Each structure stands twice: as C-alpha cells, then as structure tokens.
What we know:
Order of helices and strands of chain A: H
Protein name (chains A, B): Tip attachment protein J
Structural class of chain A: mainly alpha
Family (chains A, B): Belongs to the Caudoviricetes tip attachment protein J family.
Largest sheet of chain A: none
Oligomer: part of a larger assembly
Radius of gyration of chain A: 11 Å
Helix content of chain A: over 70%
Organism (chains A, B): Escherichia phage lambda (Bacteriophage lambda)
Subcellular location (chains A, B): Virion; Host cytoplasm
Subunit structure (chains A, B): Interacts with host LamB.
Amino acid sequence: TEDNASRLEEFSKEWKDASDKWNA
Amino acid sequence: TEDNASRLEEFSKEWKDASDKWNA
C-alpha cells in the first residue's frame, strides 16, 4: 500500500505537469 | 490495496501511451 501510494503520488506530479501543458 | 495497485498499474500503461502521444 505504501509503495503504491508513493509511486502514484510521484505520477501525480507528472500528470499535473501534463495538464498544465494541455492548458497552455 | 492490491485491487487499487493493480487497477492503477493498468492505468499507468494507458497514461504512458498518452505521454507518448504527447511527445509526438
């Protein structure tokens, strides 16, 4: 559970960056 | 926890393909 949470929180920043790229 | 990890690892491949489309 902790590994899954950590890896997906890491992916969350990347996908937030992708969303920011989409906004521009 | 295992169901969540499995489903999000499945989503990870789809979002990696989405990032590949982002690059192209």
